[PDB]
Structure formats: structure tokens, C-alpha cells
Amino acid sequence: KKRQWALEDFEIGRPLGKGKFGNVYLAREKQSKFILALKVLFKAQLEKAGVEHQLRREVEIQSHLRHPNILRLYGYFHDATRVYLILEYAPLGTVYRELQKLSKFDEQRTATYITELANALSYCHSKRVIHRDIKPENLLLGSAGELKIADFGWSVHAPSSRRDTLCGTLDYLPPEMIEGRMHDEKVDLWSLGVLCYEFLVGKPPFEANTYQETYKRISRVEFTFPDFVTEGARDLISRLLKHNPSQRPMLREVLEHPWITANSSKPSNCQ
Ligand SMILES: Nc1ncnc2c1ncn2[C@@H]1O[C@H](COP(=O)(O)OP(=O)(O)O)[C@@H](O)[C@H]1O
Numbered sequence: 380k381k382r383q384w385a386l387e388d389f390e391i392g393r394p395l396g397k398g399k400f401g402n403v404y405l406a407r408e409k410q411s412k413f414i415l416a417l418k419v420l421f422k423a424q425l426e427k428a429g430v431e432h433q434l435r436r437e438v439e440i441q442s443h444l445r446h447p448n449i450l451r452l453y454g455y456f457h458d459a460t461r462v463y464l465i466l467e468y469a470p471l472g473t474v475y476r477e478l479q480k481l482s483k484f485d486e487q488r489t490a491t492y493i494t495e496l497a498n499a500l501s502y503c504h505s506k507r508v509i510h511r512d513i514k515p516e517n518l519l520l521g522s523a524g525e526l527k528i529a530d531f532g533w534s535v536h537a538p539s540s541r542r543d544t545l546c547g548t549l550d551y552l553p554p555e556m557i558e559g560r561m562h563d564e565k566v567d568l569w570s571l572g573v574l575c576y577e578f579l580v581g582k583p584p585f586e587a588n589t590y591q592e593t594y595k596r597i598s599r600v601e602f603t604f605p606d607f608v609t610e611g612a613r614d615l616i617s618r619l620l621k622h623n624p625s626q627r628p629m630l631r632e633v634l635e636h637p638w639i640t641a642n643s644s645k646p647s648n649c650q
């Protein structure tokens with residue numbers, strides 16, 4: 380802290396993206412000319428939805444984490460109607476957007492994102508911090524195209540129970556999570572498998588037309604591989620998507636998986 384910011388301190392720019400209770404804008408600090416992102420939240424909306432506490436966890440957890448593959452939060456401020464989170468600006472956008480553009484990624488790009496992701500999560504887990512909402516819309520890209528995990532509104536310390544109502548898609552969530560059961564860091568490992576599959580295939584493994592059917596797919600762990608997915612990718616993905624949390628690999632096992640080391644351009648680091 381030691382810098383109480385206010386809106387007049389920034390020149391607001393173009394909309395970077397859309398959030399649940401406000402948008403994110405590009406912005407520049409008037410004095411230093413530092414470019415960053417401003418996440419805007421409408422108080423009325425936060426309170427009405429009763430998620431004021433997730434915003435609080437997001438600020439406290441993210442402002443304290445320091446890792447190259449984790450989006451920094453510099454601070455916050457608010458006015459009559461709004462809260463503003465000052466974030467590290469991510470120039471290359473979201474992985475969600477990169478996936479819509481390319482339809483699907485090659486093994487090198489996929490393996491490299493998985494490595495950056497695993498590294499980031501390795502650092503979170505060493506503090507028993509579970510992200511629990513790892514989705515491509517929350518995976519951002521730095522100036523070098525490196526992956527950055529953002530949106531810690533669902534993060535919590537492990538072990539944990541689920542007190543909050545789910546809202547969006549169930550696609551990236553493991554069984555223990557969609558069932559409200561107790562859970563831990565292994566939740567993020569399941570999500571990693573879902574991402575690996577979607578990066579390579581172009582759509583998540585349990586995708587279905589309805590919430591009710593997606594829920595069935597996830598519970599029964601019902602997924603199949605298109606012919607083009609290689610043996611190595613199938614192996615890693617099948618290891619990650621295990622119904623029993625304890626059967627899922629440790630991040631180190633993921634980082635040293637032969638298929639990952641063979642295709643990843645960047646080095647692992649859970650060291
Ligand atoms: N630091 C950032 N740099 C660039 N774009 C961002 C940044 N933060 C968020 N966005 C964009 O805003 C969208 C929503 O932001 P997010 O922080 O996930 O809000 P919410 O908690 O409502 O989901 C993202 O999916 C992305 O498109």
C-alpha cells in the first residue's frame with residue numbers, strides 16, 4: 380500500500396474484457412505513465428449477489444502472490460458506486476480468445492502453457508492456495524506470450540468445503556467440487572487436465588448441451604479422444620482426469636511427464 384489511489388489518477392482507455400459485475404479497462408497512471416488494467420466492480424451488484432467476500436479473498440490473495448505466471452494486483456480503491464482493482468496489464472489477451480482464433484493449439488504451445496500453468500500452481504499450492512476457477516477466460520498472456528493466471532475470486536486455502544453457489548459452466552470443475560464435497564489442491568490438477576484436452580481438441584472433454592448432462596459426464600468421467608490426439612497427450616490427460624482426487628498426479632509428475640518435457644519450449648520449476 381502506501382498509495383491511496385483515486386480515479387482521477389488514471390486515464391481510462393479501451394475495454395479489455397467483460398466480467399460478471401463490471402468490465403476491465405486498459406488505463407494509464409497520469410504521473411508515471413504506467414500502463415495497467417482497471418477491473419471495475421459495481422457494489423450494488425456485488426452485494427445483491429452476496430459475493431462481497433470473494434472480491435475480498437481475490438484482493439488479499441493476489442496482492443500477496445509473486446510469480447511470473449500469476450497476474451499481479453497492485454492495489455484498489457472505490458467510490459460511491461464502485462470498487463476498482465488495479466491490475467498488471469496483459470497485452471496478448473486471453474487464452475480463451477487465442478483458442479477461438481486458432482480453433483486448437485499444437486502440442487508445443489499446449490505443452491508450454493501446461494508447464495507455465497503447473498509452475499504457477501506449484502507456487503500457489505506451496506501456500507495451500509487453491510485457485511478452483513482455472514478457465515481459459517482467466518488465463519492471460521504477457522508481452523512474451525507467457526501464460527498468467529488471474530481471477531482469484533474463488534481461491535481459498537486447502538482443505539476446503541464449498542459454501543458458495545456455482546454460477547457458470549461446470550466444464551473445468553472436478554466431481555468433489557460440483558458435488559459440494561470437501562476438497563484440496565487436487566481440484567486444480569483436474570482443471571489442468573481439462574485445459575490440456577481443450578487446448579488440443581478445441582473443446583472441453585465433458586462438454587454437453589445442458590448443465591444436467593455436463594454434470595453427468597463429469598461425475599462418470601466420460602470422455603473420449605479424437606483420433607488426432609497422440610499417445611503421450613492421452614496418457615497425461617487420462618492421469619489428470621481421475622475421479623478419485625488422490626489418484627491424480629502431483630504437479631512435479633506433470634512437469635516431468637515425458638510428453639510435456641518433449642514438447643514444452645519452457646523449463647519446469649516446482650524446484
Ligand atoms: N489484467 C488484464 N489484462 C487484460 N485483460 C484482462 C485483465 N484482467 C481481466 N481482463 C479481461 O477481463 C475479463 C474478465 O476479468 P476477470 O478478472 O476474470 O473478472 P471476473 O471476476 O468478473 O470474471 C477477462 O476474461 C479478460 O478478457
Ligand SMILES: [Mg+2]
Nearest residue numbers: 398516517530
Ligand atoms: Mg474471470
Ligand SMILES: [Mg+2]
Nearest residue numbers: 530531532533
Ligand atoms: Mg472472479
